[PDB]
Design a protein around this ligand. Sequence first.
Ligand code: HEM
Ligand SMILES: C[C@]12CC[C@H]3[C@@H](CCC4=CC(=O)CC[C@@]43C)[C@@H]1CC[C@@H]2O
Length: 407
Amino acid sequence: LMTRIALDPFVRDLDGESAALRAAGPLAEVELPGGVHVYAVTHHKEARALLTDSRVVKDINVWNAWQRGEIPADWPLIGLVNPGRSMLTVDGPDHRRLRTLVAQALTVKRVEKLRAGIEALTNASLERLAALPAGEPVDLKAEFAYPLPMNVISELMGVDAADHPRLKELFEKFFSTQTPPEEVPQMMADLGTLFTKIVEEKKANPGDDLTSALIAASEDGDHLTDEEILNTLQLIIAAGHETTISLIVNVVEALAIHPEQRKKVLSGEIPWEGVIEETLRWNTPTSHVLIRFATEDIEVGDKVLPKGEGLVVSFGALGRDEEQYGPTAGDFDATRTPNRHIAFGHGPHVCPGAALSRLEAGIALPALYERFPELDLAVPAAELRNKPIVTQNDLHDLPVKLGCPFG
Ligand code: HEM
Ligand SMILES: C[C@]12CC[C@H]3[C@@H](CCC4=CC(=O)CC[C@@]43C)[C@@H]1CC[C@@H]2O
């Protein structure tokens, strides 16, 4: 086993961390912030295997370190490691019960119906740009990427829009490695009190949206506790806004660095669905997914994940496995045709909202470059920088000069 790798909480060099984990694969020793030792799978072939192995589980009571009360309650990463009972944290027969009404609501068919809505919100956001003074840089993150998927997923769950500025300011702190440990459990307090408030707004006045579809259904021949709903709602609002925002940003960043490919994208030669997929492989929004545990020793290539130890899937590292995609695994090629990446997961927990975000991004990007065909970065590509979020590949801002609307 190669030298232990300590995930930098300031994300000063993601591309090199990823390469190191690549080198230390298939299974690498890793240290999470606060000195917590866990292992990490960093190869494509082997990550598929562990994700479909029933010996690898989400029950934290299987974690040696947690049995032995070694994980501070004040830990910054506790939010991710132990978020409570939901689809995310259980397995096998118990899992299917919490997933099913959510997996049905986000199929290609049942999400096609939201398109009208997404075109609406995009075509608006575009109006608000250009409404800004031309010539002067704009943060494409704050003005376009952030609000769009939030609005969407708010609509989907029927969340009141007057809680947006408050939800923004809370998720900011949840993800930051530089949020002060004494501040943790009044942030989590207020998330809980925020989500409980709007769940009761829904019981009082049930709408057609998915929050209410969970409420009515539980009462008859299937499951769903008062807590399981509340936890399953946080999961859907968090996962479904964070990741997709980053996808959009990252697509825009990729086309900037690769302008020959951008030229062909804008002309139609390369279809947009190939750019979005390649961006997911090459520069996934989710660098690391937290937390599984071996029920017993598992062979992993020529190493062993010892029974009781934590496991991380390093999607960022494995997104450029040359064993999987050949010698060009390190480069953005939007035409890379057979492209069976796992940015969305594998086995039982694989993303149920893949089709939603593929849809949001496949509407919003071509809309933006139809309106602003000259749009390029306002800063050199190397000055762009990751926010301090160890699991996520999030940029701080994306300043661009729009360059006059040919819409
Ligand atoms: C670019 C966008 C996205 C990426 C890269 C992404 C990635 C992932 C990954 C890797 C997982 C697996 C978690 C694990 O195996 O431990 C996952 C699970 C999940 N994602 Fe996504 N996701 C995206 C968008 C969304 C959206 C839009 C929604 C909801 C509308 C969503 C909801 C979920 C849920 C509910 C789970 C848990 C499913 C389960 O545990 O069975 N995600 N996502
Ligand atoms: C844990 C969590 C649900 C699961 C989310 C997590 C944000 C990070 C994230 C990104 C993914 O790619 C999968 C879903 C996860 C792992 C969310 C933060 C709050 C919410 O309860």
